[PDB]
Structure 1
Amino acid sequence: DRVRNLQSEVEGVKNIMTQNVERILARGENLEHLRNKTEDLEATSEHFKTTSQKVARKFWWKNV
């Protein structure tokens, strides 16, 4: 049965693509999570830079 056989091949690709869509939906959620974490990381890095600038000023004036 040749029609049934090609249909089985289409069904096999469809099954892999269905899983690929499920997994790319999960990836999008994991990316959203990571984006929020990296936004917070960027803010934290600003605090670190600001505090380090203030300390460099302090030690510059301590040493004339």
Structure 2
Amino acid sequence: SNRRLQQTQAQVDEVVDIMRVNVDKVLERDQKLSELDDRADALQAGASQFETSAAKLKRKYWWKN
């Protein structure tokens, strides 16, 4: 009967509503990660340069521990 068909249909529309929200959340995750991927790459680039400056600085003040 519809006694089960309509019940099943109803429990499908809910999981659909929940998932459309989840899809909206992973699209936020997507943008945030995209931003972090940029930031972590700049960070690696900036840390790399700092390490070269420190190496130079240590040679310059070679009597400092």
- State the TM-score bracket (shorter-chain normalisation): 0.7 to 0.9
Distance 2:9 2:18 in 1: 14
In the TM superposition, structure 1's runs of 4+ consecutive aligned residues that sit over 3 Å from their partners are none
1:1-64 mapped onto 2 (5 Å cutoff) = 1-60=3-62
Partner AA of 1:58 in structure 2: K
Structure-2 separation of matches of 1:55 and 1:26: 43
**Aligned Cα root-mean-square deviation (Å):** 1.5
Deviation (angstroms), 1:2: 2.2
Q: State the one-letter code of the partner of 1:25.
A: L
Larger RCO of the pair (alpha carbons < 8 Å, separation 6+): 2
Question: Unaligned stretches of 5+ in structure 1?
Answer: none
Q: Which runs of 5+ in 2 are unaligned?
A: none
Q: Quote the sequence identity (%).
A: 32
The 2-side partners of 1:47 and 1:22 are apart by 38
**Structure that is richer in helix per residue:** 1
Counterpart residue type for residue 54 of structure 2:
S
